[PDB]
Design a protein around this ligand. Structure first.
Ligand SMILES: [Ca+2]
Ligand code: NA
Length: 220
């Protein structure tokens, strides 16, 4: 997160760190047994770390739970990054409390200008901060999104952030949450680097995937 601020400890209780030796991506807890993240974050082995703030210090309120299943969207395209979404089933249910909580899936898509909260331990320009970073940022119109990335924005992508630059999610934030009005509307997906002028962050449009997410949870 560039141009952000340090989150209050555990103030983002749906935020998880994906770890395979070190932190490599974010995710969002959306069910006691399931985390949603980005398909481009895929690894065959993943430890989910919930209740984190300082990922480099054992504070005590963390829950470390290995991934038992990892399901990438069947129509995920690694070129266009269309359908950049992945579900992780936890080996055991996360225990929900004040510091570890589910975030609601969208009830509808979000209108342009809706204020969101983006968070992660990604780059802020060894590279990554210890402490979870936060950024407030608005949903941009589909127009501003498409203008910025001609021919590259599908119906499954939203831009969230600032055309001006200096405020954006970066590598390491990938797979992490964009939450607007209590609902997970975006998953950190891609961009042209980060925080550059007229290159706002591009995010998987979660409001298109509620039925696929529910189906996947129901089946597995
Ligand atoms: Ca910790
Ligand atoms: Na935290």
């Amino acid at each position: 997160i560039v141009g952000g601020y340090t989150c209050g400890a555990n103030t983002v209780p749906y935020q998880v760190s994906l770890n395979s030796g070190y932190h490599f991506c974010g995710g969002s807890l959306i069910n006691s047994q399931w985390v949603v993240s980005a398909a481009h974050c895929y690894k065959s082995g993943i430890q989910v770390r919930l209740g984190e703030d300082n990922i480099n210090v054992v504070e005590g309120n963390e829950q470390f739970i290995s991934a038992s299943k990892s399901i990438v969207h069947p129509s995920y395209n690694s070129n266009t990054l269309n359908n950049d979404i992945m579900l992780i089933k936890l080996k055991s249910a996360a225990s929900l409390n004040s510091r570890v909580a589910s975030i609601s899936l969208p009830t509808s898509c979000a209108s342009a200008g809706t204020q969101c909260l983006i968070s992660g331990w990604g780059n802020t320009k060894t590279s990554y901060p210890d402490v979870l970073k936060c950024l407030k940022a608005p949903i941009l119109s589909d127009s501003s999104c498409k203008s910025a990335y001609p021919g590259q924005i599908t119906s499954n992508m939203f831009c969230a952030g600032y055309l001006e630059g200096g405020k954006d999610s970066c590598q390491g934030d990938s797979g992490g949450p964009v939450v607007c009005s209590g609902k997970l509307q975006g998953i950190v997906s891609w961009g042209s680097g980060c925080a550059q002028k007229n290159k706002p962050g591009v995010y998987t449009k979660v409001c298109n995937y509620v039925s696929w997410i529910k189906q996947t949870i129901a089946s597995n």
